[PDB]
Amino acid sequence: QLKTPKNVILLISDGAGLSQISSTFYFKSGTPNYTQFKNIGLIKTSSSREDVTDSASGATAFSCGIKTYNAAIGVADDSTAVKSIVEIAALNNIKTGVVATSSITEATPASFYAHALNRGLEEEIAMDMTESDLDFFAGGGLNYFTKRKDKKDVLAILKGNQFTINTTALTDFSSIASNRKMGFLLADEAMPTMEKGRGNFLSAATDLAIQFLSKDNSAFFIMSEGSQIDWGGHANNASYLISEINDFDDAIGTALAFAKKDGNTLVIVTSDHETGGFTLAAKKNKREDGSEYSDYTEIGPTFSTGGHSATLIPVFAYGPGSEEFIGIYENNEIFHKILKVTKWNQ
Amino acid sequence: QLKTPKNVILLISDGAGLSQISSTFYFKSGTPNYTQFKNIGLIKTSSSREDVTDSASGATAFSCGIKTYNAAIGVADDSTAVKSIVEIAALNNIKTGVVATSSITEATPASFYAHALNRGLEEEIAMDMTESDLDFFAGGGLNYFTKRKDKKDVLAILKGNQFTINTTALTDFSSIASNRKMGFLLADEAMPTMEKGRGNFLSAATDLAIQFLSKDNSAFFIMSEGSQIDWGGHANNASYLISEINDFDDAIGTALAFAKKDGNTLVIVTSDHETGGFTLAAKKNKREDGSEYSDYTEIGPTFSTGGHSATLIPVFAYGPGSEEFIGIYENNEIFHKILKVTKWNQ
Ligand SMILES: [Mg+2]
Ligand SMILES: [Mg+2]
Ligand SMILES: [Mg+2]
Ligand SMILES: [Mg+2]
Ligand SMILES: [Zn+2]
Ligand SMILES: [Zn+2]
Numbered sequence: 001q002l003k004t005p006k007n008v009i010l011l012i013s014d015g016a017g018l019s020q021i022s023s024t025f026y027f028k029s030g031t032p033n034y035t036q037f038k039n040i041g042l043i044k045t046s047s048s049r050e051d052v053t054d055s056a057s058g059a060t061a062f063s064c065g066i067k068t069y070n071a072a073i074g075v076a077d078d079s080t081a082v083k084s085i086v087e088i089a090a091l092n093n094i095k096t097g098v099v100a101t102s103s104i105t106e107a108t109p110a111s112f113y114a115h116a117l118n119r120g121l122e123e124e125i126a127m128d129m130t131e132s133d134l135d136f137f138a139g140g141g142l143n144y145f146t147k148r149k150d151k152k153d154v155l156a157i158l159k160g161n162q163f164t165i166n167t168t169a170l171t172d173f174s175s176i177a178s179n180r181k182m183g184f185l186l187a188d189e190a191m192p193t194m195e196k197g198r199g200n201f202l203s204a205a206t207d208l209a210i211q212f213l214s215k216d217n218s219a220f221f222i223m224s225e226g227s228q229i230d231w232g233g234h235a236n237n238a239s240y241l242i243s244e245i246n247d248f249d250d251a252i253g254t255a256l257a258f259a260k261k262d263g264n265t266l267v268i269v270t271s272d273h274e275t276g277g278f279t280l281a282a283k284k285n286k287r288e289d290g291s292e293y294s295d296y297t298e299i300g301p302t303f304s305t306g307g308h309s310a311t312l313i314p315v316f317a318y319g320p321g322s323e324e325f326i327g328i329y330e331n332n333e334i335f336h337k338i339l340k341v342t343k344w345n346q
Numbered sequence: 347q348l349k350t351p352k353n354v355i356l357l358i359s360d361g362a363g364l365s366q367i368s369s370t371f372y373f374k375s376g377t378p379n380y381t382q383f384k385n386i387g388l389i390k391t392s393s394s395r396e397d398v399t400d401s402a403s404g405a406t407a408f409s410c411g412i413k414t415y416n417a418a419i420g421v422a423d424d425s426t427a428v429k430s431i432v433e434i435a436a437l438n439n440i441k442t443g444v445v446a447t448s449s450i451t452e453a454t455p456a457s458f459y460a461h462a463l464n465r466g467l468e469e470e471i472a473m474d475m476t477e478s479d480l481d482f483f484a485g486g487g488l489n490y491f492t493k494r495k496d497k498k499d500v501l502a503i504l505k506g507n508q509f510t511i512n513t514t515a516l517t518d519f520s521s522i523a524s525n526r527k528m529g530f531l532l533a534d535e536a537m538p539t540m541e542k543g544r545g546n547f548l549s550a551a552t553d554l555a556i557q558f559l560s561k562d563n564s565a566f567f568i569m570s571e572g573s574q575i576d577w578g579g580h581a582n583n584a585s586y587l588i589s590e591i592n593d594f595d596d597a598i599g600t601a602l603a604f605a606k607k608d609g610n611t612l613v614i615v616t617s618d619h620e621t622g623g624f625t626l627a628a629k630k631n632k633r634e635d636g637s638e639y640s641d642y643t644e645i646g647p648t649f650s651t652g653g654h655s656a657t658l659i660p661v662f663a664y665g666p667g668s669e670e671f672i673g674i675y676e677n678n679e680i681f682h683k684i685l686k687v688t689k690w691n692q
């Protein structure tokens with residue numbers, strides 16, 4: 001008989017397989033926050049139609065608990081809308097928040113608040129934000145609200161729905177405490193990469209979300225995404241991938257610091273799939289003309305594809321109910337397990 | 347208390363990272379035996395001197411509980427001999443066995459019965475067999491016992507040590523049940539590959555070991571190795587790798603079927619490290635103009651290196667004490683955790 005968590009924080013590292021996670025044990029200063037986890041599981045990520053998943057179907061597995069087609073956003077294999085964990089949270093009086101380092105309309109965040117036939121429908125997804133039950137969000141994507149092809153002003157619709165919107169910077173908690181709902185759109189498209197000076201946006205915004213959503217003793221659900229780990233993978237760019245996931249691990253530390261002190265919070269860390277076939281290979285040394293040989297003393301990261309892969313993905317869980325997440329299961333069971341441990345009305 | 351295993355079976359898949367494990371979920375008929383595990387942990391595999399380990403230091407970490415230099419067999423970083431789990435087991439009146447699909451003198455099994463400064467000293471390692479307390483072994487490597495530089499007949503010496511030796515085939519248990527010690531040397535060098543018709547030697551030999559060592563109600567320790575998964579990795583040969591790890595997963599099923607019925611047996615499955623950067627990438631198609639694009643509906647396994655990599659490696663544990671093996675830790679803690687749960691003393 002497991003404990004029942006009041007709050008849940010789901011952290012998603014997009015495109016991080018176990019090799020990507022492992023990089024933090026060789027390329028980060030200090031010990032990775034990954035090490036705080038005891039309860040570990042594995043998820044199989046295939047979609048309803050494809051052995052190799054995309055971010056949309058992979059994230060909809062988590063948010064809605066079904067296998068669906070690549071590119072689907074909160075819809076079933078037949079394109080019908082399906083009830084999400086955010087919509088369940090709202091109906092159980094749970095405050096909800098979403099954070100990402102991509103545009104907020106990108107596939108991962110979108111899967112938690114919208115329902116669309118295709119991830120490419122980003123202006124539609126932005127409009128869906130206005131009819132969602134989200135109480136908090138932070139990410140990029142200002143363009144999809146204020147520079148649309150349909151020239152509509154969705155910002156104004158957002159505010160007309162009780163959202164306080166900031167497009168300048170993240171503020172402290174006291175700045176927004178009196179607000180009913182809070183949205184941060186801090187970039188036209190994607191937030192800056194770590195290498196271009198994003199700094200600790202992800203941890204800070206996650207921390208902000210926790211404070212805001214736990215106002216007045218309220219239970220909360222947060223999804224925070226380290227979005228750009230995936231983009232380093234596609235680019236086969238090791239320093240990009242590594243800096244992005246180091247930042248993600250920082251965010252884990254933030255969620256865990258709150259959970260350990262709160263004692264009523266379940267923290268789940270996982271990924272939607274792996275990308276690039278990132279590998280912590282031996283550093284390649286030279287010499288005159290044997291030319292190229294392997295030196296096992298050090299690591300020289302390599303890649304084998306420009307796209308995703310179907311490896312199983314690690315799941316990490318800490319807090320009340322975390323035991324439910326061990327063993328091996330389908331990605332969509334994440335949803336059903338969250339629902340199980342929280343005991344929320346379906 | 348909960349709980350003390352009487353017996354331990356350690357199954358080592360040489361060179362299998364999570365991606366290699368994952369192939370069993372796409373390329374094997376039926377559900378992988380991997381799915382039987384609930385308790386899962388992760389190990390860091392770096393040696394005492396190298397970020398990227400080899401099979402010798404990697405296995406010595408398991409067998410002797412210390413970090414050591416690449417190529418070391420049952421010796422510490424300063425090259426001094428250290429007590430292995432097989433020796434400790436003997437001291438505690440525990441029967442012992444080693445099974446491998448490579449030569450029985452190869453790095454992995456050797457680290458469990460021999461002590462040598464370098465893994466390449468295989469004729470010395472075969473001779474070390476004569477001074478170990480091993481009760482049972484099965485594998486290849488007949489050459490290292492009978493066609494040696496020193497022209498000695500090591501089988502003669504073993505037979506003096508109460509070994510019965512079979513160089514013809516795996517037999518029924520009734521053929522060996524009255525032997526005091528049993529050794530199978532079923533190939534001159536490595537056992538045949540699955541593709542060349544090795545069949546279920548690995549499962550069969552493990553079953554034989556269990557039945558033989560649990561004679562007279564004795565407790566036992568067994569290490570069985572899926573030795574050739576690694577060679578598949580080095581060769582960047584996908585069918586070779588996958589067929590070898592599917593065989594390994596059959597061995598898992600064999601061990602678990604016994605353990606579940608026995609109720610007093612701890613089964614640990616892990617790997618020494620990953621090799622080849624094996625990746626379950628999307629199938630690559632060619633458009634007669636630009637050629638390469640991805641088809642996410644199917645998998646096309648790819649590789650990115652010819653050597654090992656430093657990814658964290660999954661640990662699976664079932665049975666009494668299995669909870670001790672979760673979380674993230676150094677590879678050499680495998681030794682200490684086994685001792686802790688078995689209460690095998692020094
Ligand atoms: Mg994403
Ligand atoms: Mg770079
Ligand atoms: Mg080996
Ligand atoms: Mg082949
Ligand atoms: Zn993704
Ligand atoms: Zn991607």
Ligand SMILES: [Zn+2]
Binds near residue numbers: 618619
């Ligand atoms: Zn190895």
Ligand SMILES: [Zn+2]
Binds near residue numbers: 654
């Ligand atoms: Zn190797």
